[PDB]
Amino acid sequence: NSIQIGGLFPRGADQEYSAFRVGMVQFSTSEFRLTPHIDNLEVANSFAVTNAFCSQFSRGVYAIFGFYDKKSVNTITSFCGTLHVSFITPSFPTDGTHPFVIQMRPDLKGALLSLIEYYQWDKFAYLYDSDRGLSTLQAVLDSAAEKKWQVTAINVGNINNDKKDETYRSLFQDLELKKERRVILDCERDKVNDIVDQVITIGKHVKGYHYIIANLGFTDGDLLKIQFGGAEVSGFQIVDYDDSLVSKFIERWSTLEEKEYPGAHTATIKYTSALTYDAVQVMTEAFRNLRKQRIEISRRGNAGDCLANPAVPWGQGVEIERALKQVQVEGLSGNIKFDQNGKRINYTINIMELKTNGPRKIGYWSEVDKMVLTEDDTSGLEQKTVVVTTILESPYVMMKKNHEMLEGNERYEGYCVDLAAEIAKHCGFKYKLTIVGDGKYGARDADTKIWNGMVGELVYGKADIAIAPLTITLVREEVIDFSKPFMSLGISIMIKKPQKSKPGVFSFLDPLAYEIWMCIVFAYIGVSVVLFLVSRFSPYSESTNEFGIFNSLWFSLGAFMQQGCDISPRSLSGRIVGGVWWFFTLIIISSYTANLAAFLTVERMVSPIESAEDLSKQTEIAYGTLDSGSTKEFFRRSKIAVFDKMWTYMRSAEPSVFVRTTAEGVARVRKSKGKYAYLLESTMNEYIEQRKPCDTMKVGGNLDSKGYGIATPKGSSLGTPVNLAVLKLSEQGVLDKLKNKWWYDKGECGAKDSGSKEKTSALSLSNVAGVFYILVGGLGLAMLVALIEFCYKSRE
Amino acid sequence: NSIQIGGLFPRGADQEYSAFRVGMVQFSTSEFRLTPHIDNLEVANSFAVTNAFCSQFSRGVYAIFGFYDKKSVNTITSFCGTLHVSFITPSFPTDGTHPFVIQMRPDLKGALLSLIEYYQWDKFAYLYDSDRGLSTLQAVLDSAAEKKWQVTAINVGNINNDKKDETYRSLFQDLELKKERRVILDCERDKVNDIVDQVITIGKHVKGYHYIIANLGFTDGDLLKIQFGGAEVSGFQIVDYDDSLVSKFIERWSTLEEKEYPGAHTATIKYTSALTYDAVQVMTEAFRNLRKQRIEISRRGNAGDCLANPAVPWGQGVEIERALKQVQVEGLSGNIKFDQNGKRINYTINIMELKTNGPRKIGYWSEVDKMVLTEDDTSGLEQKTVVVTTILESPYVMMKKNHEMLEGNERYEGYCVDLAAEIAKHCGFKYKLTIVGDGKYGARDADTKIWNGMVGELVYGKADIAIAPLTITLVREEVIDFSKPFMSLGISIMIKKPQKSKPGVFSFLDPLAYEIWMCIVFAYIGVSVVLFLVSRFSPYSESTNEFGIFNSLWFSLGAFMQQGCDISPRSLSGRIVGGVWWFFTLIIISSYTANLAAFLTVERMVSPIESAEDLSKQTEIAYGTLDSGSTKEFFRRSKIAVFDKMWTYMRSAEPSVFVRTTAEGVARVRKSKGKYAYLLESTMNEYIEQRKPCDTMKVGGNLDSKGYGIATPKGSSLGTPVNLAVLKLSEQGVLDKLKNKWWYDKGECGAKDSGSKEKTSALSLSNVAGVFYILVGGLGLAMLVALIEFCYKSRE
């Protein structure tokens, strides 16, 4: 016996009925075929829906296919659950777990929330039409409360379409007042078409806008209107046309007679009619399985008009409902399986984007995994992070303290790190920072043609790029491509900061200079001799004055040292000598004390090297450079006279003046107590000078001029994008901001600012220790002279 | 009598033919009738045009109305010139002078260039169609060469009906390679519609784009679809529907049956049909005038064919041509006149813009006056200006060096003035800098209620806004209102910078302080007395030493002066006295010379006063404020103890310490040479302190916290917008930039650090002049003592 089924189609659903008849033709079999009796109803009218439902129920219908609306979901559910009559529908799923309702439409709320999370949306509008229920609006509000979103929900279904359908222009100005560029269209195809028309009219389909079409019919709309505006349009598709079943259906679908099959003869199919076809498949499979299980469900050709008291449900409905539940098939809408409540499970919803060349899939969504990308256009060349070989040193690449759990790009900070970050941001590639295995910047080995590991790994591609403190030079640039310099500097000489001068034993002579002391002694002898000669050549008895040669010497000594003698000249010429010597000693003593006072104030005495010219002349202070660095190669090939002199020294030095690392050079400078100097680039020298301790400074006038560049292996396609990005950074001045941050904002060396002033201390015994030694020596000498006299008269 | 005329109507010119028939009905008359013979043909085919022309000539057509194209203009012009047959056309005007061609379409090149130069365009794209001639393109290129425009001319018409594709997108992305937001559409209605459709499709109709529809049919096309995009759309209109005659025509045209007259039953008509109607008017007026002149217009029998050898013309053609030329009427397209070449003159082109509410006229263009604005709906809205009141103050409102010829606001400067006048620009007029009439910030007269110049002018409405160094205070808030203060300030005290202290007569005593000198004298007497006591009470027999009281005094004086004595104590107690006095004198002399050295090296300034209390405590210093400025009100209002003391002084002070102007106060400070002090706002104190000469300084902290604001009469509508503008400027931080530019960046008197001392220079006689006076006085005293002794023994 033929299975009598019922059809409840909405008015104007021509395509749905055409797909229904197509499914009836396709799934008809030799043993039997379903015989539907259909009525066309205004599904929004519950009274008409009930009339049709009871007309079919009294007709002997075993299962009712059809549609419902927000105004008729409840009556359909209640009648089906009370009379135990199964309802297979492609309309929107019921909010609750309603029995005897087979729901062919998958749940969209989870897919919509996952897609919103994928784009990392927090602020967005949610334009909804209430014709399919507010379940998705409730879901987005609940998930906004949970996830801290800001959702502006606007109801567009209240527009009085009976008269006009134009209030959207005033609607979108509210979004303009809220600066909402991200909008969700929870509407069916007609309403989303109207929204898109008004969006285009007011010019909001342009770059910067993003629309999500919150329905399973992304391609069923007129997407071509908004395709070229530049705004992102994305949505969900249940009918993935790139499949065997859908393609086989559509090749016949496009060739059906349009008058016989209204809505057919098109390259695309509305998802509602696709679900209608899949529902026909499901229910015919269910009935064939029921017969295959030898289950009989026949009943008499009359019913209780839905209004018998009490209700009289047949018993075999549970069997039919279970058969419908356990049906699992493959169809146009993907895998089809229902849980015990009729909700579809194991389904897949495709996520698509509307690009300039058309709408195409970007991934899919499933009940077991959320928002899985399609993995199309697979990687293999540019998804791998590039290997950046750099070197470790304080101003550019540092080891961060909490290295026990930090990762490759988080373990390191500095100028190189953030410059690489900015260059990658402009070029659009991902990266990892690695240290150079050789631990040195590398240079060619002379006469042996041996290269360090950097050249081999660059050739092999293991060293993808070298964003590192590497200097521009001709020898390297013919072997590896170099970008435009981001910093200009040169080689500088770095010496230990001199300490305060330590007084010597004979430092009491310091204020007045050696030649002045020589001439003071000579003037003393001359004054004494002239005084004696004046006083004693016949002045007309002899010895009328005490001024013999020895007494003249004693008087001259007393006058210099400002100790009044026991005798004074009484002649004119002798008094002339005395007065001029007195003037001399007054000026000299005043000069000594005034000079000493000047020196005891005002610090900062002497400096070892001034312009690296004296460095090349003097031989006590040994000086060297980094080994295998650019500076050493600079000194080899420099034909400048002073630079050639410096190279001829540095090559022939008996001890090793070179060091492997910059830290080793700084440690050698600090350890070698001022008699070593290290030639290193200006920037690192400034950084070390500003760091603590401040025991080293920069001297010399920036010997040469060189620039830092990002190294690239020869012929690499990455050479020009990094070159243009570095030029962009140089012209925009962000490099200057990084320079300020990493050098000028960390001037921790307060001694350079010279903001503090010391207090003069008491003179130490060391400052005048020499006069004590001269005093004791003279006392001993006097005793010795006295004893001699007594003995004589007693007988990069 | 009837006159036969010809018709050259393109196939598809249905509205043109309908307007022709309507004009023939309307301008019909009983005295004579026009008999049209009409051929419909492809005007782009010269063969068809010429064969129709010859067919119409063969039947003695008096004058030929019709249209032509770029491919057929020359045929018409040549045949009309050779056969002396007049041609009346609404088509594009001929590129040069041509007889027997009456042209109804006004020239657009001048209007287009005027509209371009009104928007101050200098870089725009020019999209042109070839079907209407390249004369406009040539004029644009010539004017661009003359005026240095950048014109990107693109031949949109090159993609003809055979090359029919949606390739405009490639064109518009080509324009995006140059950032060309300004586009001119030199195309007819159809091509303009296609361009606008593609513009809307790819989102080029958004705000920031501006289009000039370069044709006389701005409003006859479909402008509605681009109306709401936000992009500016402007054009030209020859038919003004607000005119009486045009309205009378359209109120009958719109009601006429469209089935009988194609293109009728519309609220608007294409301008070409309007020119067809006016051409019928002109032709019938010309023939009426010919009849009124009784010209023998009867034709000489058979006209013959075109290809006559020689092509002898008929003589009536020149009379007919002149009659057509000298017709002057008013019709749908405004006033109608023709020059000797047939080009229309005295015409008016309406300039229109596409607003959100529809296209509207913004002006009109004529041969005599070019691009005159209509001022309708713009000349709306006491004073038509904003008379900003300022006060001449150096940091805020200076007088320009070129005051003898500068005019307007350029005579002064102001940033906040023009930011506040942005609101006036929104109102629709510029700002005018004006100096306050009484030159004072203004204050209420106490107990008399007499109103100051500001008191009246900012409440009578004579000044609708005031920008000045006018300070916020409570007394003014009850009568006027202020915006948020835009800078901070405080009342501060300004005094003359002290000069270097010149030495006094007795400045040689300065290093050691008065108490030390007193105690030195007392210690001298004590030491001398004790020495005499220990050396002269009975040693056992007295007179064994020379140390009497006078000799003891002499020895102690010599020991202090470090001048050798003649006697020495020669006893234990006496030598104890001597040694302790020697130690005293060593320390004292060293201290004197060391402190003198310290003073002569470092110069300190120490201002006479340091705080507000110093002014209150010091009575000699005369200090005052500006009269009528907010500072004087602050001193009355203040109940603070120190400020109440200051006011109780200044109120009952010596001859008036107040001044009228800031310049007067500064001149008083500089003139008083130290003993005057001026209390005024700090900002002017830093300004004047940084200016030359720097003989003034700011001393002490700010007496209070105050601020300037924008003044406004009570309840005026400008208050809220200027308050919002000030708050926005404060948030934008431009006020800080202005502060830096006007105060910090000037500098010119920057203070030096603790170093950079000037050279010491020699010690002047004044520094030691008093010691000379004491020496000479002592010498005179010694002479006096000696003479006395000789005389005695001689007998805002």
Ligand SMILES: CC1=NN=C(c2ccc(N)cc2)c2cc3c(cc2C1)OCO3
């Ligand atoms: C480290 C120094 N400190 N002491 C003395 C010095 C000399 C004398 C006395 N009484 C105390 C201290 C000195 C003086 C100078 C000078 C260098 C020195 C060396 O150059 C210019 O005069």
Ligand SMILES: CC1=NN=C(c2ccc(N)cc2)c2cc3c(cc2C1)OCO3
């Ligand atoms: C460049 C000179 N430097 N030395 C002396 C000078 C004077 C005396 C002695 N014993 C040594 C040196 C000098 C001193 C001055 C002066 C200018 C000079 C000239 O103005 C203020 O005192």
Ligand SMILES: CC1=NN=C(c2ccc(N)cc2)c2cc3c(cc2C1)OCO3
């Ligand atoms: C303008 C000054 N200039 N001369 C002397 C002064 C004293 C003695 C000699 N020989 C030269 C100059 C002075 C010294 C001072 C002092 C103020 C002055 C006044 O305060 C601390 O010691």
Ligand SMILES: CC1=NN=C(c2ccc(N)cc2)c2cc3c(cc2C1)OCO3
């Ligand atoms: C605050 C003091 N100020 N005065 C003396 C001092 C010493 C002697 C005389 N006659 C006057 C004043 C002083 C001198 C110093 C010193 C610390 C002081 C302490 O360290 C370097 O020499």
